[PDB]
Structures are given as C-alpha cells and as structure tokens.
Amino acid sequence: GASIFRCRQCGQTISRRDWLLPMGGDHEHVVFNPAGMIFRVWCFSLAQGLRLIGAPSGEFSWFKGYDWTIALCGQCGSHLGWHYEGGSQPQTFFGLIKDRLAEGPAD
Ligand SMILES: O=C1CC[C@H](N2C(=O)c3ccccc3C2=O)C(=O)N1
Ligand SMILES: [Zn+2]
C-alpha cells in the first residue's frame, strides 16, 4: 500500500518508495522558501511524469552545489517540487513536496 507516489491532484504516476534518496542522511528535509512557505520535501533519485520548466538556478537552493528547475505534474500542471542538477553524488535528484503526492499500491 505504500509503494507508488502519484500526483495528489490528478493521479499521474510520479515516483516510488524504492526511489527515495537519503540526502544529508534523511530523505525528508523541512525547508522554507523566500515567500515564507514551509515544505516537507522528500528526496528521490528518480521520478517520471513531470514536466521540468525554466532555467536551472542556484539561487536560494536548499542543497549545496545544486541548481534547481521547477517540476510540474506533466498531466495537470500542479507544482510537485523541483529537479536538482549540477552537483555530485548524486549529480541530480528530485525534491518533491510530500503533501502534493498521494502514496499507495500498484493496482
Ligand atoms: O531549492 C530551492 C528550490 C526553489 C525554491 N524557491 C521557491 O519555492 C521560491 C518562490 C519564490 C521565489 C523564489 C523561490 C525559490 O528559490 C527555494 O527557495 N529553494
Ligand atoms: Zn497532476
């Protein structure tokens, strides 16, 4: 019942529990943006069904050495999180907003 993560707003398949990545020791990171919004961000090595938009940027990055791009649900356009790139071990990963995903079984 806990294996697949889907978009909460439309059901698009996004990631899997098996693809969780413990960045800095924890797959979960609680962070704030410049607009004062708090997010519980889950780190994943891999995700699918997103649409990555905009130019990568280092500004305000919560993960040192990475640049981010906005990750939208590719089906509904809900903002699900960010794609990180340009770093090391790993080079890239996804930080997705936990409350914007629904977790459940494969069937
Ligand atoms: O690592 C990240 C991802 C992007 C995220 N972020 C936002 O959520 C945001 C909203 C408004 C203006 C600027 C930002 C920005 O850098 C942020 O603050 N850090
Ligand atoms: Zn969606």
UniProtKB/TrEMBL annotation:
Zn(2+) binds at C7, C10, C73, C76. Coiled coil: none annotated. One of its GO terms (molecular function) is metal ion binding. Ca(2+) binds at D26, E28. InterPro entries: CULT. Keywords: Calcium, Metal-binding, Zinc. Residues 2-105 form the CULT domain. Gene3D superfamilies: Peptide methionine sulfoxide reductase. Transmembrane segments: none annotated. This is Cereblon isoform 4. It comes from Magnetospirillum gryphiswaldense.
